[PDB]
Every structure is written in C-alpha cells, then in structure tokens.
Motif scaffolding. Sequence first.
Motif, short mmCIF file in Angstrom:
data_model
loop_
_atom_site.label_atom_id
_atom_site.label_comp_id
_atom_site.label_asym_id
_atom_site.label_seq_id
_atom_site.Cartn_x
_atom_site.Cartn_y
_atom_site.Cartn_z
N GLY A 37 -29.49 -14.64 12.59
CA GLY A 37 -28.48 -15.54 13.11
C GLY A 37 -27.06 -15.03 13.04
O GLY A 37 -26.14 -15.80 13.33
N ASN A 38 -26.86 -13.77 12.65
CA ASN A 38 -25.57 -13.08 12.62
C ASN A 38 -24.42 -13.97 12.16
O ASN A 38 -23.32 -13.91 12.73
CB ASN A 38 -25.26 -12.46 13.99
CG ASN A 38 -25.32 -13.46 15.13
OD1 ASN A 38 -24.65 -14.50 15.10
ND2 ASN A 38 -26.12 -13.16 16.14
N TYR A 39 -24.65 -14.77 11.13
CA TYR A 39 -23.63 -15.70 10.64
C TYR A 39 -22.59 -15.04 9.75
O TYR A 39 -21.77 -15.75 9.16
CB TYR A 39 -24.30 -16.86 9.90
CG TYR A 39 -25.31 -17.62 10.72
CD1 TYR A 39 -24.92 -18.36 11.83
CD2 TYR A 39 -26.66 -17.59 10.40
CE1 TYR A 39 -25.84 -19.06 12.59
CE2 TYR A 39 -27.59 -18.29 11.16
CZ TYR A 39 -27.17 -19.02 12.25
OH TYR A 39 -28.09 -19.71 13.01
N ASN A 40 -22.59 -13.71 9.64
CA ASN A 40 -21.59 -13.00 8.87
C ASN A 40 -20.29 -12.78 9.65
O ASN A 40 -19.44 -12.00 9.20
CB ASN A 40 -22.14 -11.65 8.41
CG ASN A 40 -23.48 -11.78 7.71
OD1 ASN A 40 -23.58 -12.28 6.60
ND2 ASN A 40 -24.54 -11.32 8.38
N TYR A 41 -20.12 -13.45 10.78
CA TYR A 41 -18.95 -13.29 11.64
C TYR A 41 -18.17 -14.60 11.65
O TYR A 41 -18.57 -15.56 12.31
CB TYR A 41 -19.37 -12.87 13.05
CG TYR A 41 -20.02 -11.50 13.09
CD1 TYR A 41 -19.69 -10.53 12.15
CD2 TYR A 41 -20.97 -11.19 14.05
CE1 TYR A 41 -20.28 -9.28 12.18
CE2 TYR A 41 -21.56 -9.95 14.08
CZ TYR A 41 -21.22 -9.00 13.15
OH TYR A 41 -21.81 -7.76 13.18
N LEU A 42 -17.05 -14.63 10.93
CA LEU A 42 -16.32 -15.85 10.65
C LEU A 42 -14.94 -15.81 11.29
O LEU A 42 -14.50 -14.79 11.82
CB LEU A 42 -16.18 -16.07 9.13
CG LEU A 42 -17.37 -16.65 8.38
CD1 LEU A 42 -17.38 -16.16 6.94
CD2 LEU A 42 -17.32 -18.17 8.41
N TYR A 43 -14.26 -16.96 11.24
CA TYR A 43 -12.89 -17.08 11.70
C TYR A 43 -12.27 -18.34 11.13
O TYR A 43 -12.96 -19.35 10.95
CB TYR A 43 -12.80 -17.11 13.23
CG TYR A 43 -13.70 -18.13 13.88
CD1 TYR A 43 -15.02 -17.83 14.18
CD2 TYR A 43 -13.22 -19.39 14.21
CE1 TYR A 43 -15.85 -18.76 14.78
CE2 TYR A 43 -14.04 -20.33 14.81
CZ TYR A 43 -15.35 -20.01 15.09
OH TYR A 43 -16.17 -20.93 15.69
N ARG A 44 -10.97 -18.28 10.84
CA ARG A 44 -10.24 -19.44 10.38
C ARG A 44 -10.22 -20.52 11.46
O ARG A 44 -10.16 -20.24 12.66
CB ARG A 44 -8.81 -19.04 10.00
CG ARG A 44 -7.83 -20.19 9.84
CD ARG A 44 -7.97 -20.85 8.49
NE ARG A 44 -6.71 -21.46 8.06
CZ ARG A 44 -6.31 -22.67 8.41
NH1 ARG A 44 -7.04 -23.44 9.19
NH2 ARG A 44 -5.14 -23.12 7.96
N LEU A 45 -10.28 -21.78 11.03
CA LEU A 45 -10.33 -22.93 11.93
C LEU A 45 -9.01 -23.68 11.91
O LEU A 45 -8.56 -24.12 10.85
CB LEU A 45 -11.46 -23.89 11.54
CG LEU A 45 -12.88 -23.57 11.99
CD1 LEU A 45 -13.84 -24.61 11.44
CD2 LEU A 45 -12.95 -23.50 13.51
#
Lengths: 50, 49
Positions: A37-45
């Motif tokens: 699920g490649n959930y290691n790619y984040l960003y501030r909201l």
Amino acid sequence: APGQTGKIADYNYKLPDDFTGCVIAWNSNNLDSKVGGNYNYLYRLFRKSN
Amino acid sequence: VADYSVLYNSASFSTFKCYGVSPTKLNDLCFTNVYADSFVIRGDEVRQI
C-alpha cells in the motif's frame, strides 16, 4: 505550478511566481505500486499559513 | 454567510477552474447576490463550459 493553490501546490511544496525551469512528470505506477500500500509517502495537511 | 474557505477544501473536486477570481480570495469580498447553476455533463465536455 506557479499560479495554483492546494494540498499539492502550497501545503506541501510551493513553486515561486518568478520560477524558471522545467517540471518532469512520468508514469512510475510500475515500481510505486506496492502490495504493502506504499503508505510510506506522507505530506503535511492544511498548514495554517502558506 | 458562506464558508468559501472550506468548500474549496474538499479534495473531491477534480476540475476546479475559478475564472472569476482566485479560490482562496473567495473569503473576503462581499457578493451582491449569487447564481448557483447545478447539473451533470459528460466527462469529455467538462472544460467546454
């Protein structure tokens, strides 16, 4: 792009109004398609300012 | 009173073209009145309007 606002335009990373250069986009759905699920790619909201 | 700040915030909007004014500036100006024309069209002709 210089002239847009949003989660992808300012909340994560901004392009200056006098920017000169080249953006490059290509279809990396082959490697990026992760069975985990490649959930290691984040960003501030929704940062309170720009 | 319209919460034009948060209406823009819903990420469902796939074609959000504000020819009138910039989106984030919807908050300050005071509108004389408003037209709210709603319908559904083809996926190809989304930008013909």
